[PDB]
Design a protein around this ligand. Sequence first.
Ligand SMILES: *[C@@H]1O[C@H](CO)[C@@H](O[C@@H]2O[C@H](CO)[C@@H](O)[C@H](O)[C@H]2NC(C)=O)[C@H](O)[C@H]1NC(C)=O
Ligand SMILES: *[C@@H]1O[C@H](CO)[C@@H](O[C@@H]2O[C@H](CO)[C@@H](O)[C@H](O)[C@H]2NC(C)=O)[C@H](O)[C@H]1NC(C)=O
Ligand SMILES: *[C@@H]1O[C@H](CO)[C@@H](O[C@@H]2O[C@H](CO)[C@@H](O)[C@H](O)[C@H]2NC(C)=O)[C@H](O)[C@H]1NC(C)=O
Ligand SMILES: *[C@@H]1O[C@H](CO)[C@@H](O[C@@H]2O[C@H](CO)[C@@H](O)[C@H](O)[C@H]2NC(C)=O)[C@H](O)[C@H]1NC(C)=O
Ligand SMILES: *[C@@H]1O[C@H](CO)[C@@H](O[C@@H]2O[C@H](CO)[C@@H](O)[C@H](O)[C@H]2NC(C)=O)[C@H](O)[C@H]1NC(C)=O
Ligand SMILES: *[C@@H]1O[C@H](CO)[C@@H](O[C@@H]2O[C@H](CO)[C@@H](O)[C@H](O)[C@H]2NC(C)=O)[C@H](O)[C@H]1NC(C)=O
Ligand SMILES: *[C@@H]1O[C@H](CO)[C@@H](O[C@@H]2O[C@H](CO)[C@@H](O)[C@H](O)[C@H]2NC(C)=O)[C@H](O)[C@H]1NC(C)=O
Ligand SMILES: *[C@@H]1O[C@H](CO)[C@@H](O[C@H]2O[C@H](CO)[C@@H](O)[C@H](O)[C@H]2NC(C)=O)[C@H](O)[C@H]1NC(C)=O
Ligand SMILES: *[C@@H]1O[C@H](CO)[C@@H](O[C@H]2O[C@H](CO)[C@@H](O)[C@H](O)[C@H]2NC(C)=O)[C@H](O)[C@H]1NC(C)=O
Ligand SMILES: CS(=O)(=O)c1ccc2c(c1)nc1n2C[C@H](N)[C@@H](c2cc(F)c(F)cc2F)C1
Ligand SMILES: CS(=O)(=O)c1ccc2c(c1)nc1n2C[C@H](N)[C@@H](c2cc(F)c(F)cc2F)C1
Ligand SMILES: *[C@@H]1O[C@H](CO)[C@@H](O)[C@H](O)[C@H]1NC(C)=O
Ligand SMILES: *[C@@H]1O[C@H](CO)[C@@H](O)[C@H](O)[C@H]1NC(C)=O
Ligand SMILES: *[C@@H]1O[C@H](CO)[C@@H](O)[C@H](O)[C@H]1NC(C)=O
Ligand SMILES: *[C@H]1O[C@H](CO)[C@@H](O)[C@H](O)[C@H]1NC(C)=O
Ligand code: NA
Lengths: 728, 728
Amino acid sequence: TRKTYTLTDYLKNTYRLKLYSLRWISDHEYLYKQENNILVFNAEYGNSSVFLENSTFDEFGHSINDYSISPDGQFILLEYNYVKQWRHSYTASYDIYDLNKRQLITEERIPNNTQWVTWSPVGHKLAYVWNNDIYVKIEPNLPSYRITWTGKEDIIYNGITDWVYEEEVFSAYSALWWSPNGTFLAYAQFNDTEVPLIEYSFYSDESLQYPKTVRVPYPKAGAVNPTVKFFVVNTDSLSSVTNATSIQITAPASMLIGDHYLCDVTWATQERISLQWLRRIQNYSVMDICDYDESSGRWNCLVARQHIEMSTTGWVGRFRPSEPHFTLDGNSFYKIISNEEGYRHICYFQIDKKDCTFITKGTWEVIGIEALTSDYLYYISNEYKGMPGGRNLYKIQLSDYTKVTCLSCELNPERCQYYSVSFSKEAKYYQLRCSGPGLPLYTLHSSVNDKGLRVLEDNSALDKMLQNVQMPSKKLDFIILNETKFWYQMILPPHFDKSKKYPLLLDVYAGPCSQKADTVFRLNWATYLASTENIIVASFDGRGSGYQGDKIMHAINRRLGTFEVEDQIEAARQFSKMGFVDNKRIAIWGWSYGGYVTSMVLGSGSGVFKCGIAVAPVSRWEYYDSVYTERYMGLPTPEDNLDHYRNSTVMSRAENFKQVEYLLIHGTADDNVHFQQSAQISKALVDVGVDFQAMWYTDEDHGIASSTAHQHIYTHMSHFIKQCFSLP
Amino acid sequence: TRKTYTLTDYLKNTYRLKLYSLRWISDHEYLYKQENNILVFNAEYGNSSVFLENSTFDEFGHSINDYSISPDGQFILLEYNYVKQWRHSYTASYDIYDLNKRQLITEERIPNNTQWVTWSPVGHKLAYVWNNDIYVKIEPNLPSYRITWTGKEDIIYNGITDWVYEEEVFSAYSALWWSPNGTFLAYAQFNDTEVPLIEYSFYSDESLQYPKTVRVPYPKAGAVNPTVKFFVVNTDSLSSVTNATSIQITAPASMLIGDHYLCDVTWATQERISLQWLRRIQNYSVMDICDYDESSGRWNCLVARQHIEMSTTGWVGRFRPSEPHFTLDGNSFYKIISNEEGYRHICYFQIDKKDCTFITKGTWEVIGIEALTSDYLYYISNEYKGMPGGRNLYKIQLSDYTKVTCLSCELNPERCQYYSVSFSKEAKYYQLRCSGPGLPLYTLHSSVNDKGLRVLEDNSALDKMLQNVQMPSKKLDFIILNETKFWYQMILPPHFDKSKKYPLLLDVYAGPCSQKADTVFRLNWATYLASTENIIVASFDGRGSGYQGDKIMHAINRRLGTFEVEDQIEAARQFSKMGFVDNKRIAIWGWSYGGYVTSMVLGSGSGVFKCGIAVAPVSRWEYYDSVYTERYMGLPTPEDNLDHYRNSTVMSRAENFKQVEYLLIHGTADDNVHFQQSAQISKALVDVGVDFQAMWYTDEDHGIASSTAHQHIYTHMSHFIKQCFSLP
Ligand SMILES: *[C@@H]1O[C@H](CO)[C@@H](O[C@@H]2O[C@H](CO)[C@@H](O)[C@H](O)[C@H]2NC(C)=O)[C@H](O)[C@H]1NC(C)=O
Ligand SMILES: *[C@@H]1O[C@H](CO)[C@@H](O[C@@H]2O[C@H](CO)[C@@H](O)[C@H](O)[C@H]2NC(C)=O)[C@H](O)[C@H]1NC(C)=O
Ligand SMILES: *[C@@H]1O[C@H](CO)[C@@H](O[C@@H]2O[C@H](CO)[C@@H](O)[C@H](O)[C@H]2NC(C)=O)[C@H](O)[C@H]1NC(C)=O
Ligand SMILES: *[C@@H]1O[C@H](CO)[C@@H](O[C@@H]2O[C@H](CO)[C@@H](O)[C@H](O)[C@H]2NC(C)=O)[C@H](O)[C@H]1NC(C)=O
Ligand SMILES: *[C@@H]1O[C@H](CO)[C@@H](O[C@@H]2O[C@H](CO)[C@@H](O)[C@H](O)[C@H]2NC(C)=O)[C@H](O)[C@H]1NC(C)=O
Ligand SMILES: *[C@@H]1O[C@H](CO)[C@@H](O[C@@H]2O[C@H](CO)[C@@H](O)[C@H](O)[C@H]2NC(C)=O)[C@H](O)[C@H]1NC(C)=O
Ligand SMILES: *[C@@H]1O[C@H](CO)[C@@H](O[C@@H]2O[C@H](CO)[C@@H](O)[C@H](O)[C@H]2NC(C)=O)[C@H](O)[C@H]1NC(C)=O
Ligand SMILES: *[C@@H]1O[C@H](CO)[C@@H](O[C@H]2O[C@H](CO)[C@@H](O)[C@H](O)[C@H]2NC(C)=O)[C@H](O)[C@H]1NC(C)=O
Ligand SMILES: *[C@@H]1O[C@H](CO)[C@@H](O[C@H]2O[C@H](CO)[C@@H](O)[C@H](O)[C@H]2NC(C)=O)[C@H](O)[C@H]1NC(C)=O
Ligand SMILES: CS(=O)(=O)c1ccc2c(c1)nc1n2C[C@H](N)[C@@H](c2cc(F)c(F)cc2F)C1
Ligand SMILES: CS(=O)(=O)c1ccc2c(c1)nc1n2C[C@H](N)[C@@H](c2cc(F)c(F)cc2F)C1
Ligand SMILES: *[C@@H]1O[C@H](CO)[C@@H](O)[C@H](O)[C@H]1NC(C)=O
Ligand SMILES: *[C@@H]1O[C@H](CO)[C@@H](O)[C@H](O)[C@H]1NC(C)=O
Ligand SMILES: *[C@@H]1O[C@H](CO)[C@@H](O)[C@H](O)[C@H]1NC(C)=O
Ligand SMILES: *[C@H]1O[C@H](CO)[C@@H](O)[C@H](O)[C@H]1NC(C)=O
Ligand code: NA
């Protein structure tokens, strides 16, 4: 009898997915780490050489965290002393190694505690941020030029984001943007002066006698937000003037009338930059297109080139307005926007014409634009077989929009229904990454003829291992509610028998634009629960979920904690109707937004669920950050949406928790969903006399991702679920 | 079949002990609140009158928290807007009502947020502290004289104690001492300038968007301590035109050489005050006896009148050096100190002679001196029947120390073995309070022939109620370890059958000078566990426990987390070999110091205990406060006791928790044992991969005493214990 996929298997990573992470350094070469060596590969022929021997930095005296080659291949940036901050941010030390001299650079070093560093896109200029100010080095061994003098910890951020811009706007710590040939450096400056601080204890190693109070500028919903300014400096003038001027580009009047955000920066050409601004009420966005004026040294944004993007039904964009993709001459661009039917499709704009032309259409959505050449645009969509949870690469002929080729659909249709892609520098080659429903498959292709060049990684090692294991299966299907298809997936135990009644765990996220029903192959906690414990683990994408049009996505507009919650309950009722579910053993669990929905469901009084687990839940929308929360909820004021803010809290349902077994879990150093959120849940449950289970994770953040804590939480949750399901 | 004593009975206070809380106002009369009416009783005959009608303040407008009648009976101080701070501190608003003209004083009122208020001991002067400064009112309707001007929140404390002096030294927020007739007001001033602050989150009501950070000056072991100065002011020579002059009494040179504490203030006469000072290394203390010099207006403390009290085996005093009890002329005094055999007995000192004479002796201890006349000294001791956990009132003839009379021993030997006493102003009468082993019994007596005048409260109502409940019994007995008797108690189930095996829960405190085995009647959680769940609840007093001499008490000097933990394991080992104990079902629990011991026991690898619960435990002595910790541990420096601080932590034992079930509980607003301590425990268990149960209590402190949290914790603990013992 074949073994099952056990909890220890999951927690110890005994069955490991192989990846193929390459880095394009040109239009036909990529770097690949093999056996701690860095190899350089020729894409056309697949032959390789050693770029950097594994033993090069033995006597470096530090463990190197990451590396970065300069665009001209002359230098490598060595990252060490990595100290993580938030989701994207971190600090590090940096050395520069001269590749042609085979020497480490010892003068005018990038300082310790550097917050961000980036090569120019061409050559080997560097911009870095240190103590919240910007510096540029023209040559790796020469002195830096200071660009800003206003940087102030927790107060003024030049070239880096504050907490909320990092998490909610840019998904990056960096807030600087080199022009395409590196002449100009554009950057944002954030002012957090009147932004309130979240404060929480950090206990650290047991040697620390007094706990530290961590203090982070964090605007909760309705609070004072950071303000923002945008500047461009000419780095080519740095060696010529004592103090090069940062030229400000001001937001349009339609933004300046109130609170607003900078939400996108995209260079079009050497002397043309595009900026998108978003009103604090996030249903109105404005793109400015600004040109360098050689005679005045200023940047001017013609109103004839200004583009409005607004929504009557919800917010703008999936999580933010989409990025433009400019044609080489910078006189036109492509952009994913919601069409008249509410489906996100590629629109083609002339920079000085307000009406765009949709180049794709249908009842499915474009996920992203991946590459653009003079002849073709390449994009990912979920068109294939009308499956919103699939992803495929398509190529559209720019001179004839009726010519649309699916590049990935039919490569291995049984094994591969979810693709991402990685193009070489000028799109001469592409790497396809299939992530399911079979084992991930990595392949290389040439764009000139769309022929497969070779398989890079096929996970045959893992396939061989998994043959000796009773693996679960995955069903992806839909149910029809109110004449609309809503998709679900089930992780089903090995030897699934429809004539039996299985315990069911509903795995929930259900945030706006979420998707939990897809074609991705995963080895996770659900795999163990199905394989070893014979539990069906289900997920459902109801109202508010993404990639299916605005009618579904915007259904929860101004109303979080309503339809997305109800639809999870309804999903569980539908799963019972299917006849293989033990109605006495239905559980629910989720993390983050999923913890909020789980808690809302458990407090609904539905009677459907025996037990559930919320990890790091939101409990009350006024506790969560402004940019995310207000996008869906508006402002917590009597004149806007306070009534629904107050009506959608977990705490107001405390009394209904008498009907369920609840486990509440939160990391004490969660900078994102503050421990406060679960602290208020537990207190409301104490106050009505509801018994529940609890677990805090000392110094863990929103990820609860340290090796020991990750193993501890999943072990704790497994005992809880098994107890609930009367499993030995 | 009758009911058992249930968890709800405990939680809802179904069976209430009656009290008789009286306030002596003279040598012949006391006050007693009955049906909200304050009555005055004649002690000799037991007749009464209404002193103040409950209706007097019908339209007062505020709920009155407490009252305080001026010593002369002319005024009543009304306390309201009570807001708790630490164990003893709070602020309140006050009004003064004139009892003769039957009116509230509206002129020159005591301010809101007053920190401490006290009548002079004679007449009706007031001293109060507001905004950390001292004020005096000679008459309730007259303007206050500001005594001090240096008061500053969290920094300078005049006439009130800081966190550590409140908790550890004075067991009070007051640091004011009126002279016997109210002429002088002595006070301490605390300076916390360089004392570090503990910081922790307070979440408050759900409406609070951002948590508050509470910051309290709190010296952890080895940290910078508050400094102290001492002053006396003449309240008879106060002026409206000139600021008051306070005369400083400086500490002896033997104290000034380093860190030290003021640990006792006791007036001897109208013009003689005594002060005891304690070195930071708390095995050396000095009493100064200081006299007012009428010609110089200074206070002089003759070196011939200094009394040194030191210890070679431990620290000085039980928790601090004892209070002296001065004779009428203040030329001599009586003081409990450890004798040459290490038993605490009453010594008689002349103010200017070095040697004292012990007036009591034997292998038992005096608990306290209660009253002193020219003929007799009245004290409580555990002499009777050699039972360390019993308490009786004795008097000793001062002219013939061989003449000692027990005044309570034989009153009711079966019902009453544990007494406290309240004497009238000149010891003409006394109230005895019997608190076990039977129901509390309150009686009044006259000193001249020790007549038992009357029964004040016999709890006969409770007796009648309890007749219809299956109540547990208590066994008090001893075991012998290494030729020494150590006492234990067992709360035994109703209808105890020594031929049956019962599960056993070891209820532990075990701190230095603790006593958990005694003759006190209690209705608590253990009552429910025994009566309803048929669990034996045992407690044991091993090495480090009090009231049995220093050989036992000082056994843990410089070595907390050693013998007191070992001895709990040994007691349980012995209990487990008794015929009526199920050795497969032995548990342990404790709170505070008992939580630390429970955790050390469970991490010991003993194999004796199946499960345990630690509530608000100490985990590492470096995290607890200097005054308590260093008393037992010295300083955490390589030169002193750092090695033992480092190997007496709970965290180092994490691995040993693998074979036990552990429940760890802590309030997040614990100002005393910081949440930190449990946060470090949970992190250590996570780090070695040990599963355990947890519960935090949002905004609860060391008491976890709010009505809802109190019910919640005992509910949660009861499920845990029952689960552990396989109890339905
Ligand atoms: C992969 O092989 C190619 C083709 O042999 C290498 O390209 C050059 O080949 C010519 C042979 O005519 C030689 O002059 C050189 O040895 C090669 N020079 C270059 C441009 O590298 C190529 O080197 C190989 N690529 C890698 C990454 O190893
Ligand atoms: C960041 O914003 C703050 C406003 O919150 C600016 O601070 C003000 O500066 C002016 C001087 O121009 C003063 O008169 C005010 O007292 C300041 N207000 C506050 C609340 O401090 C600050 O100058 C901005 N910093 C930058 C670099 O833009
Ligand atoms: C480079 O120029 C900038 C911008 O003019 C200078 O920044 C100003 O510095 C002065 C005085 O220190 C302040 O009063 C202004 O408020 C600053 N403005 C900004 C945008 O920061 C900067 O100090 C200059 N550096 C040098 C070396 O001269
Ligand atoms: C990168 O682009 C910039 C901006 O177009 C170039 O700088 C300009 O060069 C032209 C020469 O064709 C001059 O007329 C302008 O004076 C320059 N403008 C500025 C703002 O510097 C730059 O030459 C390009 N760099 C490279 C390496 O080609
Ligand atoms: C204690 O607080 C109360 C309320 O703040 C004070 O009494 C007055 O209360 C009314 C409303 O209750 C306010 O209009 C006044 O400002 C208060 N003061 C006056 C002028 O009487 C009271 O004064 C405070 N007690 C003291 C002695 O300061
Ligand atoms: C309380 O005691 C003080 C101090 O003994 C008394 O004050 C003294 O009274 C005498 C009168 O015989 C004066 O000659 C002294 O000058 C006073 N000394 C001081 C320090 O003021 C006070 O009178 C007593 N009060 C009561 C009410 O008995
Ligand atoms: C008070 O306690 C201290 C600490 O136990 C004693 O001082 C000495 O402590 C150091 C290390 O802390 C040791 O080297 C000595 O053995 C201790 N002194 C001796 C016994 O010589 C101190 O002696 C104690 N004081 C009293 C009055 O006994
Ligand atoms: C208790 O009884 C005594 C004596 O019977 C009370 O009477 C004494 O005091 C009264 C004033 O309080 C006077 O009215 C009596 O004359 C006086 N009697 C004597 C001779 O002492 C006494 O007040 C009563 N006590 C209380 C508190 O009510
Ligand atoms: C309280 O104690 C502090 C010392 O902890 C006193 O301040 C002194 O120490 C300062 C450093 O914190 C020195 O810079 C000063 O010389 C010294 N005095 C002054 C002027 O502050 C402080 O005075 C004390 N306060 C009181 C009222 O006694
Ligand atoms: C698809 S995307 O544009 O890259 C994007 C950008 C930002 C995103 C996101 C997806 N999904 C989330 N976020 C940021 C947001 N703070 C995330 C989040 C939401 C919660 F409700 C929450 F409680 C925690 C949390 F981390 C989810
Ligand atoms: C008998 S006594 O002199 O009144 C006295 C005074 C102070 C006392 C005490 C007894 N018992 C304790 N304390 C203060 C001390 N902080 C108490 C305590 C000890 C701990 F180890 C602890 F972890 C918490 C805690 F509150 C116990
Ligand atoms: C970084 O810090 C290390 C260790 O403190 C130091 O030796 C080194 O000089 C620093 N590097 C730079 C560039 O300052
Ligand atoms: C943006 O949202 C607010 C609140 O719903 C609404 O009143 C306003 O009209 C919206 N703007 C657009 C462009 O629809
Ligand atoms: C009393 O002392 C304070 C503070 O030192 C001072 O400000 C005040 O004016 C003084 N009053 C008199 C009457 O001297
Ligand atoms: C270098 O990498 C590792 C040691 O770090 C070693 O296993 C490998 O064989 C080396 N590379 C070569 C030359 O194969
Ligand atoms: Na009597």
